[PDB]
Subunit: 67 residues, 6 copies
Amino acid sequence: SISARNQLKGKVVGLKKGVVTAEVVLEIAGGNKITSIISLDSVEELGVKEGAELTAVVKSTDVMILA
Amino acid sequence: SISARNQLKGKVVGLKKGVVTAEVVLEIAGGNKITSIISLDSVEELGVKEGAELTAVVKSTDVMILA
Amino acid sequence: SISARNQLKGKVVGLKKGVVTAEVVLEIAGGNKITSIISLDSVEELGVKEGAELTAVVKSTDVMILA
Amino acid sequence: SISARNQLKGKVVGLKKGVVTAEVVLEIAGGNKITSIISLDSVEELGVKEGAELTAVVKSTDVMILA
Amino acid sequence: SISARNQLKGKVVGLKKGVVTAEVVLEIAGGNKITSIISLDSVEELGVKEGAELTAVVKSTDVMILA
Amino acid sequence: SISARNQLKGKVVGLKKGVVTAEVVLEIAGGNKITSIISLDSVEELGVKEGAELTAVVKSTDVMILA
Ligand code: MOO
Ligand code: MOO
Ligand code: MOO
Ligand code: MOO
Ligand code: MOO
Ligand code: MOO
Ligand code: MOO
Ligand code: MOO
Ligand SMILES: [Ca+2]
Ligand SMILES: [Ca+2]
């Protein structure tokens, strides 16, 4: 129940932990892949691990269109 | 060939024009819907129309993770 | 349970509805005020109205520091 | 005098330096905590340190609403 | 003294007002042009108009690279 | 042909690699400089290095105005 209109369910297929940030790669419907860069603290708090089923969220104003 | 690593192909299923901004809704693999808000100038220049085959692009640092 | 680390509870003190976007102003702790621009559809779906108690959410990478 | 309408004064209560990025945590009115991830270069240039009195700035189009 | 590392001085050559947002177009050094979409209220508050000399500011995390 | 209206051609004058992110600094027309923080993987994938000619891309909704 958040304003961000793009909510994409997926499964974790990759995780890389940096000093401040962390990279999460999710496989969503149709084989598409979504890549997320978040704080390292969050990775630790949401129990992010390979195989976990999670949801990618994006604000509409952050989505560009390519023709 | 742009750094934004998230590229999701889709078809236009919704279009609403504002004074400065415009809203484009794309249907992607699995019926998921991606909503984008961009400049009105761009819709016009990219010739966005119902049925067009376009692509949604998102920077990794804009993707959040939900548990 | 989302990665975005900034979650600020507040009360709606202002709402302006545009064609594509909408502006929401919330009063949070200490009298601070937060201003949000979201899609008009969201305003309609989350039942946004003056007096409503809601939460402002922000990704860490979108926060700048001013000295 | 910048368009970002959200300006929240606070004191530094956390600082973690990465190779490229850095994390700053500010305590604002009510003990709320704001977390910011910026360039390592900037922390150094703005002389960010525990106890400093700084200000968090956020563009309105980056603030989401949660119900 | 804001952490955002991109500060581009320029002159207003275009200004379009919408209901909630506004579009500002600046001509910057060297023949380049920058386009910004911000809140209508900020435009009104900073007294933006054709001919004004202002600065465009962008967070490093929001700049993409294209090859 | 991406909707992002800001496309600034430039040359790489600085490149710093971190664990998850990377910092690219470009010199653009007219003596201006642009700094970008993107994923380390994209840098590696687009083969970014000192001297390369590339383009910085920014969404209009991410450009702030300072008076
Ligand atoms: O209504 Mo949003 O937060 O622009 O997706
Ligand atoms: O070590 Mo970083 O600056 O979190 O990629
Ligand atoms: O390499 Mo990006 O531009 O953070 O997706
Ligand atoms: O960068 Mo975060 O961990 O989505 O607030
Ligand atoms: O009428 Mo708007 O301000 O382009 O949604
Ligand atoms: O007027 Mo803003 O820069 O969308 O907060
Ligand atoms: O990521 Mo910055 O240091 O706000 O440009
Ligand atoms: O808001 Mo835009 O049309 O992606 O620059
Ligand atoms: Ca943004
Ligand atoms: Ca952003």
